[PDB]
Symmetry: D2
């Protein structure tokens, strides 16, 4: 099965499909162990986590591809990738982004209508460029739109429907904060709709049962694990500096035995003995 | 201003012992700097297990490590000590490429070890000579890591360590040293700064900076401590989301958006544009 | 079709199949236009051409994979890649080499018995490692042996046969100076044999006709294009420094117009009209 | 000496300083052997040589940095690098480009006012962002303008003068074709002026004496060696396909002995015997 096929199979069998952000290869394997069928490479995560930069379009295609290759070399879960507006203003840049994502093992990408937004025609054209570039048609192109906050609900639908006619497989509407609005949007666009349930934003923490009731097909948790990981790391750094030892934070740590199980350390001995 | 190696030497000169914390990525390098550490570390076990999701069995290569060196040192000015395993290839040419690359990508220090079981004292000394000869900035620190204590005993470790120092090694990292009296004897004999590796769940006890200072240890390394806690916290988030169909029961464990914006200096970007424009 | 299927297809339908060294993406397009069915990434070429270094094992997996991705992103000819001894002494290292070459678009690789050579079992163990790692069985694993130089022709046949047993798809014996030796080697091993025909070596400059009558399946020209490129470049630099102008060497230059045709500049314009 | 100090020194001791295109690390060493004091990484050559792509802004920062690192790892001549418009539209992208070029060991970069061209103030903003990001003031920021061809000679001089006020160290006027105009321009802008003497374009093949008389401080041969290298390689591919052997083109090849001398093969044994 190709990555795109695994992504489409996951959307078809989980309602809605939980897609969890994985900041690195290690966390991709934790997400797999936890039972998730699909994982996410957050652009904000590549910026804030891998580069220690804010999410202001400083991160480019090479930075993201490094994290895509690391993740997909060890974890076979389908990876949805944030590619912002396509890493360059030209149809040729969007095309290079698509071909690179497919070669480095991504399952899907979302591309957004950020330049305020571009015209329905100009968003339609980024999608057409992406669909044309695609060498494996199972690879999923998800249109991300911030049209609800700028033009109103019907404009959001119109634009999403134009992206679908352009060959977008799924829709990611931004800044949508009522279940009743998701249900109307989902009926009007037809294709799978993703609900972005991040923390500390305008959206309520909608449950999978609530989103299922509103006919939402995907639920994304873009940075959740990253946020808990940073609080836990800061706690260790504070304690080592304050106490001159890690004695008082040992109880917060993954054990060496747990780490050896999560990266399948003993499968490597078991491979040596099978071959030789 | 100072070179990375100069900052590493100044840190060792002004902190007794110098706490050096593992930073799995650029974000955690900034957290360590905020916590007040003067030096940071790029664990090769952490590049393998964290960046690659692989065991620490020499699968990870120079290019995996250099990616993480460049990410960290592009945004964090703290001196970065880098695990380079045995130099990423058996040849003096391979050791030289590693050294010139670490320096070009902005590393302050590397440790290179005598693992294969250890190689002969002569082969370890040759590794150190190749590293020293390749060094283009003399301030860059070459730290010799030896497992000679476990394989051949204390006196053999001392002799191997002194031969590495005669070969130009700036600092020594003895592995498997489990008693304070052994640190004190070793430090008195080798003369150059000694690093104590205080990792968790191993045979080494969790010695405090006070204890290590009394044993005349110059550096204490906490190589995967933050990473270990990061992984348990991420696993607890994944488990809760899967079970509950929401992250409701793990919101309390999370760094806030406002906290994150503060730790990556989000508002310095607005203020840079104000200054230019 | 997969790159490996395309490479086996080429061996099967050209006798012997000519495989030319392509030092960069530009020269891979020139080789495709010149009508070749297969191309080659020389490890000596990555070293001397991409890194400006001697072929002394300084170049490693990431140097080669950069050149693989550059070539395979724009040229669809099956690419045979020189991977030395596997870029690390462990079966884990050989596994990561195989999996990365498949991922980054390579069609085949050769792996050799250099340490003087390793024992037959130690060479069998590399091949079993590579074969076990192969995600796509169409991907070609070519065993390269220097056993004829060290242990005589009967050893060379024996080692080759033991590599074929281990799942090596094709054999690359090193430096045969007589067609009779090649004819015997081909008949003993059964699987396709590769004749390395480099310049300024001990080997004669055998023709496709000669090697076809010795039952040789591939013929490699590893650095031919590169050696002519370097003399031409050196001639340009010498003239510019001597003359204070390039006037007297413009006659040896590919024109702008030819370059534009060789990198299909105008097809990028014909994509802008067909898409928008 | 830092790389930027080496470029600055070369400009003050050669009138005009010849700067030649080097497509790869091998050709940077050929340039050094030729006695050039400075070398150039063409953006068009990264695209056409390294990627086999047209020069339409498909190439990005990571493609360029790979070649910068390869060249500056073996060759100590100051490298001038083409960074297009800075690889992203924001001050932060330009700042990342500058810091990367300095870290990977580039001596200088040229950044251009292309979009048609941006406003004088938008170009000044690019230069201020690059100057502000510079950690090593010895690193040379050269402003490239196509103002002459859009707005005329006085416009181009005013723009070049505003870029100098913003900390631009040198100026690269595009599509300038009369020595008289070079001479006027050089007198007006005061800082060193580069003349781009590429083949098969509008500009005459002006000599170093001719450019010196016009008070031009640098002359660039951006792709000269690469054009010769492509024609040479193609001739090898055609001859191998037709003849079924490279025998009839051996005389156009750098010999093995010459290759080993140009990559200093024997300095590696001599390094070994000195060390151990
Ligand atoms: Mg994003
Ligand atoms: Mg280690
Ligand atoms: Mg080779
Ligand atoms: Mg250019």
């Amino acid at each position: 099965l190709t990555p795109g096929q695994r992504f489409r199979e996951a959307v078809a069998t989980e309602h809605p499909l939980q897609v969890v952000g994985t900041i690195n290869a290690n966390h991709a394997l934790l997400a797999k162990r936890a039972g998730f069928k699909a994982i996410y490479l957050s652009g904000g995560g590549v910026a804030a986590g891998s580069l220690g930069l804010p999410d202001l379009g400083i991160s480019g295609l090479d930075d993201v591809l490094t994290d895509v290759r690391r993740i997909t070399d060890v974890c076979d879960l389908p990876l949805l990738v944030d590619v912002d507006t396509g890493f360059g203003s030209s149809a040729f840049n969007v095309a290079r982004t698509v071909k690179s994502m497919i070669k480095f093992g991504a399952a899907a990408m979302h591309i957004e209508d950020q330049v305020e937004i571009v015209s329905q025609q100009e968003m339609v054209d980024r999608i057409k460029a992406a669909v044309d570039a695609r060498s494996d048609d199972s690879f999923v192109i998800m249109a991300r739109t911030d049209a609800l906050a700028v033009e109103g609900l019907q404009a959001a639908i119109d634009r999403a429907c134009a992206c679908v006619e352009a060959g977008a497989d799924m829709i990611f509407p931004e800044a949508m904060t009522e279940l009743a609005m998701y249900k109307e949007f989902a009926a009007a666009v037809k294709v799978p709709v993703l609900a972005n349930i991040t923390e500390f934003g305008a959206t309520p923490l909608f449950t999978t049962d609530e989103l299922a009731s509103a006919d939402v097909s995907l639920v994304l948790y873009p940075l959740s694990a990253f946020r808990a990981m940073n609080k836990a790391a800061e706690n260790v750094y504070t304690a080592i500096r304050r106490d001159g030892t890690q004695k008082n934070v040992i109880d917060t740590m993954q054990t060496r035995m747990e780490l050896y199980d999560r990266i399948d350390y003993h499968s490597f001995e078991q491979k040596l003995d099978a071959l030789f």
